[PDB]
Design a protein around this ligand. Structure first.
Ligand SMILES: O=C(Nc1c(Cl)cncc1Cl)c1ccc(OC(F)F)c(OCC2CC2)c1
Ligand SMILES: [Mg+2]
Ligand SMILES: [Zn+2]
Length: 326
């Protein structure tokens, strides 16, 4: 059909920053995560490398995708698909050429795919404050992140869903550990510590004559993978403005809904969650200035000058958002 043709054409941009992820979600019948992951696995030859039967991969991906909530404005399957594709582009950075093994690539992409699965559309602090079952289960630490991992891994046990069935035991153990390490690092409470280590690595960085990163031990390798997926999670303001604005609309809708739940429970409304007292534009500029730009500038230094175009777009978007403030 014409719909399948236009979808295949859009997917030809899977290696490009600024892929039309919203259009892909529409064209695929709300299956962005499944089609984008499948495309990336085929692009990186991951099915042959890890002997993943195609039917098993699709069955797992559709099940995973079904566990993202369709009524959650931001933390849904579109965001998952976007973080996956963004990580995939970051892994292709010339400064990281041949740095990571196929197993580490698989871990980073899989981690990205499951990193927000079964997100209820409310924050860790909300879950802690409402004496939730999730916060009780996880003792108030990385509540959501622990849950995303548990669900992502548990779904591998469903019928014909074990995409890692042909990995050796050692490969499965290593991948599991890396995935856990990466997803737990998406908790924003760890942002400052991740960034400080990223800066430390930038200052003591070792490279080949072509500017390729030399990372020997697990500690440094996982730190870069952690920061890579963290960057992807925080990549919305670095995308073409048309995409960024859609992400902003979605995060604000999700935040406002949490604020609506807090208001009716008599709780103090969380920062930026009050629809009656919001400054969307100022908050985006502050978000860029204090979180997104410091992180991306540091990432850019690590892979210099490979991330220059991403940094340029971020600064363009910050300038535009600032111009909307009288
Ligand atoms: O925190 C975010 N994401 C997030 C991450 Cl990266 C990790 N863990 C939880 C969340 Cl909510 C997140 C994602 C996108 C945002 O806006 C735009 F880019 F869409 C945004 O605006 C902040 C702002 C209004 C004060 C915030
Ligand atoms: Mg998250
Ligand atoms: Zn996320």
């Amino acid at each position: 059909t014409e719909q399948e043709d236009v979808l295949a054409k859009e997917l030809e941009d899977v290696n490009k920053w600024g892929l039309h992820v919203f259009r892909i979600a529409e064209l695929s019948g709300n299956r962005p995560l499944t089609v984008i992951m499948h495309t990336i696995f085929q692009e990186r030859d991951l099915l042959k490398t890890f002997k993943i039967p195609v039917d098993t991969l699709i069955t797992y991906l559709m099940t995973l995708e079904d566990h993202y909530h369709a009524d959650v404005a931001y933390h849904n399957n579109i965001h998952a698909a976007d973080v996956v594709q963004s990580t995939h582009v970051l892994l292709s950075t010339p400064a990281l050429e041949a740095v990571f093994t196929d197993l580490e690539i698989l871990a980073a992409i899989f981690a990205s795919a499951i990193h927000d699965v079964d997100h209820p559309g409310v924050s860790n602090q909300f879950l802690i404050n409402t004496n939730s079952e999730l916060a009780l289960m996880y003792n108030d630490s990385s509540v959501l992140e622990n849950h995303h991992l548990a669900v992502g891994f548990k779904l591998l046990q469903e019928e014909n869903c074990d995409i890692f069935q042909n990995l050796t035991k050692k490969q499965r153990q290593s991948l599991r550990k890396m995935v856990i390490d990466i997803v737990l690092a998406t908790d924003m409470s760890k942002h400052m510590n991740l960034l400080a280590d990223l800066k430390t690595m930038v200052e003591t960085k070792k490279v080949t004559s072509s500017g390729v990163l030399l990372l020997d031990n697990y500690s440094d390798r996982i730190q870069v993978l952690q920061n890579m997926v963290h960057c992807a999670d925080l990549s919305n303001p670095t995308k073409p403005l048309q995409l960024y604005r859609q992400w902003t609309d979605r995060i604000m809708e999700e935040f406002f809904r949490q604020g609506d739940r807090e208001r009716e429970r008599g709780m103090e409304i969380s920062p930026m969650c009050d629809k009656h007292n919001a400054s969307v534009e100022k908050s985006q500029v502050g978000f860029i200035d204090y979180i997104v730009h410091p992180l991306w500038e540091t990432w850019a230094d690590l892979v210099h000058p490979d991330a220059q175009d991403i940094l340029d777009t971020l600064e363009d978007n910050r300038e535009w958002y600032q111009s909307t403030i009288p």
